[PDB]
């Protein structure tokens, strides 16, 4: 839900750490035209813990959404944003012609057109050096065989679907980030198989008589056996 997106050559990177990730806000949204995950399942992501998650965001043409994928080639995949062949994450895209196209033509969004060699995976090239396409050196001056390496998208509303701006978010999964792992209600005076914060067992949970300290969680009898627990939600000892 960001207001401004970056040009693809200068793609933005947000580092996400130490938080409970609710992926349901994403795969249950009908506002996405492209949503492809690699090496992971979209619905099975709320049950996986990762050390770091990277969200990269930029703007490209609809024609070039196909290039944001492992093992792709093209002006974007080679010279702007490259995914590795072993990519583990998700690519999400949606049309933004209503936001990123101006009537007279939007020229704030750019892409790299000239580069001597292809980008390595997750390479961010923001150079403005004049591209030496000829035998003679450029010395930072434009002219024949000396071109500005960036080219401007011409995002107009009258453009075909393939030429309208699409906003892209690439999630990279690399533990401080886990998924929700919701809970349920608890019942007393009935034999239950229970799993509290880190422990699991079978037994009957009853109202207790002990006074646990504010930082104590799991009880223990004399013979190293679990005796009482602190309910994670309700501050009651069972």
């Amino acid at each position, epitope marked *: 839900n960001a207001t401004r997106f970056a040009s693809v050559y200068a793609w933005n990177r947000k580092r996400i750490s130490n938080c409970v990730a609710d992926y349901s806000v994403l795969y249950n949204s009908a506002s996405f035209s492209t949503f492809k995950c690699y090496g992971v399942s979209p619905t099975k992501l709320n049950d996986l813990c990762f050390t770091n998650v990277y969200a990269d965001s930029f703007v490209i043409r609809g024609d070039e959404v196909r290039q944001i994928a492992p093992g792709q080639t093209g002006k974007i995949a080679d010279y702007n944003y490259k995914l590795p062949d072993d990519f583990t994450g998700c690519v999400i895209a949606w049309n933004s012609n209503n936001l990123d196209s101006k009537v007279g033509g939007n020229y704030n969004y750019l892409y790299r057109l000239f580069r001597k060699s292809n980008l390595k995976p997750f390479e961010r090239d923001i150079s403005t050096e004049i591209y030496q396409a000829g035998s003679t050196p450029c010395n930072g001056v434009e002219g024949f065989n000396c071109y500005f390496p960036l080219q401007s998208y*011409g995002f107009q509303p009258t453009n075909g679907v393939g030429y309208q701006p699409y906003r892209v978010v690439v999630l990279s999964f690399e533990a401080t980030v886990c998924g929700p792992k919701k809970s349920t209600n608890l019942v007393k005076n009935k034999c239950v198989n229970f799993n509290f914060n880190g422990l699991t067992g079978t037994g009957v949970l009853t109202e207790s008589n002990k006074k646990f300290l504010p930082f104590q969680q799991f009880g223990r009898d004399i013979a190293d056996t679990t005796d009482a627990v602190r309910d994670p939600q309700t501050l009651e000892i069972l």
Partner: antibody
Amino acid sequence: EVQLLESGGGLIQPGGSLRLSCAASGFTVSSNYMSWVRQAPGKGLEWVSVIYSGGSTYYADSVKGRFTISRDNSKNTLYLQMNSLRAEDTAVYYCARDHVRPGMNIWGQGTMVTVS
Amino acid sequence: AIRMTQSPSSLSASVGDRVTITCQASQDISNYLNWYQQKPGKAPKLLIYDASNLETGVPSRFSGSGSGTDFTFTISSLQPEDIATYYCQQYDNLPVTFGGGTKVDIK
């Protein structure tokens, strides 16, 4: 002195091979977008292959798997390796520095490849 | 793959007459359409690039306009040395495709 000079065309039996050399002057081939375009006798123009500045190769469906495009930086020469040649590959083969910006679009003069 | 259609196939006009040919695209190609002039035997020569922009050195009598899917190529006043076959090509989307061609003869 910007110009493209190409050679290597001639007669070749079907299923045979033939490499077309396109020597350049005035710019660097390994830094530009280069293209091969063939024109059958009496017909229109037909795009064949493209090499990017970074090296990515793209081919047309009618020659995919059979034709190969490459370049040599030391000689500043664009090549087109043609294998499993067919009778419908007979054409004039122009090499061209692809248009990308104002006035860099320049075509060779083509060489006659005759598969018979 | 995109398919460019070029009308008319052939054409003959007097010296000085306005000559106009069209090139309809099968898909939207924005304004990424170029125009080539191929005199007999010689290689194609780029005249119009990006639908409407004149390549440096082309006489002013050559024109180009259009965006999206319908494009036009206009000769202001036809000249005798303008006899050639003119093609249209799109290049932004792969594969690169050409038009059918238009042969031009002097009356």
